[PDB]
Symmetry: C2
């Protein structure tokens, strides 16, 4: 269940979320050692809107549509560790949680 | 700083001291525990801030207080117990400050 993702220092990495087409997302909350960001639905082609909630992450968090895949860019060694998405949707279970372990490599 | 301990009674309310002593500089506060908890942002214009709860465990049970941004978790549960963290994002340096709490819950 804890999915391992590897990223390269100074580059970008994608966290697989892949929200399917019957599910409707209300808000996804991302956390690590600090809160990271909240992601909310975009539009026709506005991609999901991302609100960053710790200064360590400002300008480094992007979200992809329609999957709601998270991209963190300009990776730092300090980004490594456990991440959690609490995915909130209109219908039940209402909240589903996904776990990730990011490891960072200077290459 | 230090972890701050707050005690609460099952079924009741507990208040987390935030004591923002310069409110209108607050952009967003992100509360987490074992799970996500809520975001709190400025009211359009008000005393009072707006809560968006971000996990169903805490649905309808999070309130914030103007003007200090103190947090209330109402209808308390035993699962509510443990370490809480607020990432307070404001308009000027350090831009993010973090407060740590320990919520002890007791029987009704």
């Amino acid at each position: 269940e804890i999915f391992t993702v590897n990223g390269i220092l100074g580059e970008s990495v994608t966290f697989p979320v892949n929200i399917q087409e019957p599910r409707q997302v209300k808000i996804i909350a991302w956390t690590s050692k600090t809160s990271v960001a909240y992601v909310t639905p975009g539009d026709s082609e506005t991609a999901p809107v991302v609100t960053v909630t710790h200064r360590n992450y400002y300008e480094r968090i992007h979200a992809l549509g329609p999957n709601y895949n998270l991209v963190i860019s300009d990776l730092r060694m300090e980004d490594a560790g456990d991440y959690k998405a609490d995915i909130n949707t209109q219908a039940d279970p209402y909240t589903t949680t996904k776990r990730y372990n990011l490891q960072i490599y200077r290459r």
